[PDB]
């Protein structure tokens, strides 16, 4: 559906196509061939410094999915309840009305407190319960 080709469309239609937004995110139309006899020019330095910032934005979120059991797929749920105090709108309502665009501007605040809680109930509690529950 195109790179960010679902950003305009509502959350429901945005969750419908979000693989392309991660597909062309790394090696798409920016990777290229990457081809006086020296490569220490202004274009050589700029491409390698940008390469470091390229992986940094991917790995930051990649590590999080890995410590949530959501690493194996694009969309995976967790065993974390939603504290009503964060957002008071209906599940189905933001999906055809608010859109991911405004929605990120709503969570961004408690987003770090959400990430903190996501680590324990789904991994620090769920995967730590396995140690005893695996053999019975």
């Amino acid at each position, epitope marked *: 559906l195109g790179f960010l080709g679902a950003a305009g469309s*509502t959350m429901g239609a945005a969750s419908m196509a979000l693989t392309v937004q991660a597909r062309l995110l790394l090696s798409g139309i920016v990777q290229q061939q990457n081809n006086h006899m020296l490569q220490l020019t202004v274009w050589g330095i700029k491409q390698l410094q940008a390469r470091v910032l390229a992986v940094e934005r991917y790995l930051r979120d990649q590590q999080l999915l890995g410590i949530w059991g959501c690493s194996g797929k694009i969309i995976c749920c967790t065993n974390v309840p939603w504290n009503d105090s964060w957002s008071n709108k209906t599940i189905n*309502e933001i999906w*055809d*009305n608010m859109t991911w*665009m*405004q929605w990120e501007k709503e969570i961004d605040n408690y987003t770090q407190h959400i990430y903190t809680l996501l680590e324990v109930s789904q991994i620090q509690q769920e995967k730590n319960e396995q140690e005893l529950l695996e053999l019975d």
Partner: nanobody
Amino acid sequence: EGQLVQSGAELKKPGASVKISCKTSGYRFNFYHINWIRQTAGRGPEWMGWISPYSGDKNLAPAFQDRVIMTTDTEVPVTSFTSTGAAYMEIRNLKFDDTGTYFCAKGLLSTWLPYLWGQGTLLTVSS
């Protein structure tokens, strides 16, 4: 919660062409649909028609087809979400049964339905 500005106190004699306007403020006018309704003196509100400001789709009642023809303009963006637009309603060959209160309504997203209404335009179709 968004506020609507409904242009009022306009009325004329039967048979003549009536033009009713409404200014939209403090919301994304583009993806939000626009609904138009009227209520007679016999407490029976007749649903006039449904119009879309992003696409040319429309749904209108058979009693309001040849008589009623609606139009909409392009959105004027204020922020990355908020915009300003307007909708016009033209009615031809009016009767004393058409006399009543005419309202403009803001859309929802099961999306075709409204969410918020305007002040009200009391149309008096009298000679």
